[PDB]
Symmetry: C4
Subunit: 457 residues, 4 copies
């Protein structure tokens, strides 16, 4: 008899790919919460007079600040097991910015041969990153019976930046959720005294990389728990293969139908018709669904890599799982359109979206003109129109009424400075928002309003 829709096991991916995403995501989130709080700790340890909030605003301006910051950072490394809580340990380094038997490396980056003097110009600056590094590594015990890191000179005129390199091995003690011996961590701190500007302002930033592995243990019943999350991706590879195999057969019927439309008896209408509706001939939504497959499966293999080998980078695969989850979950709509009544409500979008897109091109075209205009006029005077990304962000957030009073307040502060710019910004912001709220959005509403009107008749 009539067997049911065995092809509709795409519902399995609605859970499986989402659970693959949430299993990964809940573990990966939990790692970051540990990762960042450590970087918060290192800022409280290694930065001289750091505060919870000032990151971009935290910086050196005098020379004694820069010295005392560096020495404060170093002396806080030297006494890490003494004063700092959490229990870290020194790397004992064998890498590039550390010598064969060194741990903390404060490293200048300054010009090779050069000179700077206004009103008496005689110099020959030859741009170069001549890095001088001072090594230091203290032992754990008190000093046994058997130097110049303090005797250190920056050359501030000549100084690009100062980088304090070190790594801290550590044991993530949120492992007791697994209930056995822990998984092992290694932070890679970089205290950067950045002076690329030479403007008398030196951002102090402490930033870390994380490297994770499993360190020696002979105990029992930890190794089995890892395999359950490892095995679940094979369900994803099993579903993905089935989905990838299933759309292509539907495409085969596409290619068959291509023939059969003319093919029962050829010359339906002479020759060579381009059949623009036929150019949307295959029901491609399932190919779009299967392509979201390819990003899921390409995601999982790359996630299995990052898990199963020393590969440590969560960017592309993290996008590919999310994009695929999103692009599967948007696909639940075209699963939902097998219902009759719901299909009318979604068909309104699929009859309007050409018109809405065809209008949106015009709005984007104006919006860009505004993004350019405000950028060069309000880039000098105001923070929130500095770069074209930030102008577009601030404007595109300003269309919905976010930080509008906060922008308009920045204008008044520059009313004493160039009233033409203030009055220009008043006229500019008003003309931007009034157009985009009462004429654009209104028309975006009008197109779909008219679509919903036209579709039922």
């Amino acid at each position: 008899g009539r067997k049911p829709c065995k092809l509709m096991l795409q519902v399995v991916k609605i859970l499986v790919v989402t659970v693959q995403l949430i299993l990964f995501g809940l573990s990966n989130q939990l790692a970051v919460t540990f990762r960042e709080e450590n970087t918060i700790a290192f800022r409280h340890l290694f930065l001289l007079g750091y505060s919870d909030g000032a990151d971009d605003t935290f910086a050196a301006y005098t020379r004694e600040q820069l010295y005392q910051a560096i020495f404060h950072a170093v002396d806080q490394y030297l006494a890490l097991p003494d004063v700092s809580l959490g229990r870290y340990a020194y790397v004992r380094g064998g890498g590039d910015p550390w010598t064969n038997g060194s741990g903390l490396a404060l490293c200048q980056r300054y010009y090779h041969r050069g000179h700077v003097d206004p009103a008496n110009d005689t110099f020959d600056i030859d741009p170069m990153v001549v890095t001088d590094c001072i090594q230091v590594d203290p032992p754990e015990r008190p000093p046994p019976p058997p130097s110049s890191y303090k005797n250190l000179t920056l050359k501030f005129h000549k100084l690009v930046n100062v980088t304090i390199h070190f790594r801290l091995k550590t044991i993530n003690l949120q492992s007791l959720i697994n209930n056995e011996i822990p998984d092992c961590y290694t932070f890679s701190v970089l205290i950067t005294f950045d002076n690329k500007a030479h403007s008398g302002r030196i951002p102090i930033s402490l930033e870390t990389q994380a490297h994770i592995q499993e360190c020696k243990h002979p105990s029992v019943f930890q190794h089995g728990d890892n395999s359950f999350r490892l095995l679940f991706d094979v369900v994803v590879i099993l579903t993905c293969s089935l989905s990838f195999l299933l759309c292509a057969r539907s495409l085969l019927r596409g290619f068959l139908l291509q023939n059969e439309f003319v093919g029962f008896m050829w010359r339906q209408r002479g020759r060579v018709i381009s059949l623009w509706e036929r150019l949307e001939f295959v029901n491609g939504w399932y190919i779009l669904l299967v392509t979201s497959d390819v990003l899921t499966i390409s995601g999982t293999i790359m996630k299995i890599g990052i898990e199963a080998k020393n590969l440590a980078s969560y960017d592309v695969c993290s996008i590919l799982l999310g994009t695929s989850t999103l692009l599967v979950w948007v696909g639940v709509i075209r699963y939902l359109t097998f219902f009759h009544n719901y299909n009318i409500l979604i068909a309104t979008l699929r009859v309007a979206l050409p018109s809405v897109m065809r209008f949106c091109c015009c709005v984007a075209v104006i919006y860009l003109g505004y993004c350019f205009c405000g950028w060069i006029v309000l880039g000098p005077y105001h923070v929130k129109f500095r770069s074209l990304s930030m102008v577009s962000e601030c404007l595109f957030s300003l269309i919905n009424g976010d930080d509008m009073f906060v922008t308009f307040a920045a204008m008044q502060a520059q009313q004493g400075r160039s009233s033409l710019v203030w009055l220009f910004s008043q006229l500019y912001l008003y003309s931007f928002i009034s157009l985009f709220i009462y004429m654009v959005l209104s028309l975006f509403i009008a197109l779909i309003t008219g679509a919903y009107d036209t579709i039922k008749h």
Copy 2:
């Protein structure tokens, strides 16, 4: 003759249940304002270097901070009647974390037998909450003629957390609004030095429970004022019983009508008539009324409990009063529809809401796909997409233009770190907002626009 609508004494609940809610709410609000300001006081007393604002950001990072915080907390307990204003007194405790004759109890929670060491792994951690508590309680007078709380070691490597337990009895002197002798209070402070992460960051949080009772007094004319607010709930129980009794009789006529629709002469068309009409044949107004009722009456009994006995917990009953007040106040609309003209304006909603809900399922379906996608990609790099509750909160607040520039500003800060994530977030946020403002909301408007168009014809 024709007696009036005596069944329309539901108007009584519009005041009575609202007044029950406001009488309770104004007294309960007034208690919290006292409750919290005391917790603000205890943070200024018992926390070493606490500031008005930093609660989540307030934490220890070095070991001398943790010591000095604990000792500062203890020495501020020891000298509470000395230095602190407001007039408290010590509990003189006979509970669980205090011994038979103790007051302040600083209490470690640390591992039983265990060890931690990177690059030389030999340990056997056996997860346990071996709590060591140090008791202390000072007398009021100066020391008469007839120890090691300072001689205290944390074991930071081993430390889960440190909890300082105490209670403070106190007299709420906002009782003079009643005009007689006061009602009596007891706070239950818990200073938590939480280190479940072992990330070198230890949140310091001081949190209190409140226990209220009436302490000895022989004076006159306080006991009568309490009874007036006690008696008013009996009006609620009186109205509620009448409302619960009145709906069920209307439902009886429902059950009778079931028979009588076919029952004047059976087989109108066999048994053909879709009992969907039966689903709309009983008036659901009365079910809305009873849903209000049961929450009001369940509210009141639980409110009478919290008032009349040692029960001190304002959660469920506080929801049940509010839900019932809300669900009565939404019911004023279907009281309001006995008017003819108003009924057309509300009938637009009751003809559209099926379509609006049937569309909303599709929007929620996409929105979830976005909630997943942004969560794993923007969970590591950004604060505002950390967990799926916060992603949904931030997105669902971001659809209306709240903190959009503040999210887009968090993106730029992570533009140096993984440009693919920045450019992904730019494309992600834009695609989220542009869809949800110009195509979704517009269609939500279109459905009701078309409903209002269709209803009058």
Copy 3:
């Protein structure tokens, strides 16, 4: 011949009343900017460790803070001509909280006879404001040859509050805009150490009243400049009288028309005219004009009072000018409707506003139900639903997407504390905003959309 519209001199009020408002407003604004910056100065002078921002958060918690705050305030009064800039002088007081020959008066407000003790209750508190005031006033010169304000005890158990009363005479040196000798000022500072709670938190607030007058000067050409702003209100009284006289004659024709419907020949159609339509035939535009008028004229007389003697109440008159300016400026629309095309665009509002108001009653009715519900549930746990004004403010601002993420962030902070309240607030906020954005606003749009549709046919 046909004389023009001499009755249309209402255009004169569009300038005159606006100029009366701006002349007043620019002078009154300029006074406040001086008034407040002085209160900022006094906070930096007289408050111990005050910061630019903390006003509500600025408070005492220990007893030594309260002492040192008061003594710091007093010693900053004692040395005002020494250390403070701006040039003030002492009042030399002859008022109520100062003795006949005193200046600074620190004044307790504490209970008469009473006692407070938990767990050993024996007291007889007799609510009273027994105020003890300590007087002090230093001379300008160094001490010539010819006490216990430091020897002062608060009784903290007994203490309601401590108020430091003083006044500072001063010369507003922004008078040189007038170009002659200055107008003279007197501030009235009140440092309040408020402890009505007895919760160990004592808000420290410094607040001032301003009293202005003209102090001795024999010079020439200052007195003429005041008369020009004085005379301009007589133009307002001249226009107002003409407008008030003009409407009433139009109302006379109203009263005549009331008669004359039946009055050409009685029994026109029996009693078939309902007369309520006649109540909505007559033009309220002149009543709108008179409502503007009476507020303008009542404004001016009260402004002429404050100017021409005794000087110290704005509030009501300041509302009456603004309300009248607003209510005149809204009247420019019904001046604007003498045009034909514009009248169609405003007639859409005057055919829809009954329906919009008739719907709005239902929305407000739900909105109130939400305002009650959220108040008692989210009053304890959250700051932004504390009182029904603030609930309504936060909700009614939350309908447009203001501080929504900031409310939703307050929820997560109370997720550990009573998950039912968190999950309730999640469901509550969502249900509030989703209803009010996609179903309410959409219908508000639908009514006017349909009005604009229906009006042209």
Copy 4:
């Protein structure tokens, strides 16, 4: 044969003028980022106890603060090469506020002859800016073998303000992007201790001008890189001239058509052609193109001046480039209307915009009435309605739900102070937003909704 649209080389300006804008903008932005960070540096150097954030809130209140601020500023100038990083040098001044051989000039501005005293009025203030300046300039080397800037008296009663004038020459070391010897800079700092109020609050503000030039160097291959960006404006002048020449010939045909419409045979219908339609005949596209043109060309000449000449001021030319880029980019729409389908979507705007503008006049008219009303009532009590620019900003940002809860929170703070003002502001804000969201915006939507309805029929 038929040659193509050679007149459509306006597409060249879409890139050329945009690239002219971005080339300029990316270089000009990069200069400001250097310019401002230096002003951040000078605030950290020359201001006593300055913080990252407090600019408007940063100010002096006592006299010892003002002294120590000035002396701190001076002693930080005196030791600039000692302590400050970034490498500056002293001007060695020959300008107006410096003597022939001076560098740092602290300069009072105080009254000539005058006196101030309340309650004993005898004075003759004669408004004058009698400036006393104290000169100082230290040498680079230690003091060789071969005064009263500390022995300095302000006269605070008499003091308008104190200005510390100096300039710092500096070498912008972000020149290595060009890869050769740097371009040379000169900052012009002004530390202003502003006391125009005499309210005991003295804003301390440090502000700089920038003067750039090229200082001596004999090296090779820097001079060629400048010429490439110089030459690219000649492409703008080349395109602009062609565009300006092309429109005017199209206008000639305009003037010719005027004649030719009646002119094949005049008296087409008696007197009629009526001519008013001819008054509304002429095609604006080319005027929009020329309005872009003139601003581009006027921009470029002034940009060539500003860079290559006595380089002075980035205001007008910066507006003219942006306005021209914007006004060209809006012109891409009327290039886009040569398509048939797109023209219907833009024609909706060009049939509605008269009606939308004709309505907007009424909304603006009410909005102004609100802007006046709120200004005088909420100017004293609240920060966000201080001046009519800020009232309009706050209201016009408040229509979209920006800082609404933040305004409504400012109301509650003034609920104790004049409840009539609080309750007035509650009623005011509600009446403002409820009108402007549900009746105005809704009608703005309705007009375009109806336009889109009417256009297709």
